[PDB]
């Protein structure tokens, strides 16, 4: 009923594609600005095994094996995702991010030459459609359809 992204990562053995980085990014806030809404301890995002998929389509953040500021779940999500983005390549080796996507995940963990909040994040990945008004449907279905999918490779 619900695939941790780790799972998704071992069953596809290869990398997620850009666009459900966008999802996975936006669903998960999401899902931590109304957690965050209902004043929930926050939790560090560790390794891929945290980031539960829904059926229905939503990305929730679960606590880990195991003070922690907003800024750096944020962070931990965006390593994960890249890192997840990256499955299966060495080290010589990386992978060409369109920039758009580059430049979200050099934010959300610190790496450029501003983002202080689950809402900001959000606002960025809907701003990567033609119709910003169409990220909350849009992101759904691209992870519905990663869940879906992924339940067809068992």
């Not at 944020?74 to 992978?95: F, M, P, T, V």
Request: net charge negative; glycine share 2%; with cysteine.
């Amino acid at each position: 009923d619900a695939l941790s992204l780790e799972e998704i990562l071992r069953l596809y053995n290869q990398p997620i594609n850009e666009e459900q980085a966008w999802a996975v990014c936006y669903q998960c806030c999401g899902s931590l600005r109304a957690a965050a809404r209902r004043r929930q301890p926050r939790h560090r995002v560790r390794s891929a095994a945290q980031i539960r998929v829904w059926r229905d389509g939503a990305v929730t953040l679960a606590p880990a094996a195991d003070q922690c500021m907003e800024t750096e779940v944020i962070e931990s999500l965006g390593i994960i995702i890249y890192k997840a983005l990256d499955y299966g390549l060495k080290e010589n080796e990386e992978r060409e991010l369109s920039p758009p996507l580059e430049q979200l995940i050099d934010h959300m963990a610190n790496t450029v030459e501003a983002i202080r909040s689950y809402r900001d994040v959000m606002k960025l990945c809907a701003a990567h459609l033609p119709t910003e008004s169409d990220a909350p449907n849009h992101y759904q279905a691209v992870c519905r359809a990663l869940f879906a999918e992924t339940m067809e490779l068992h």
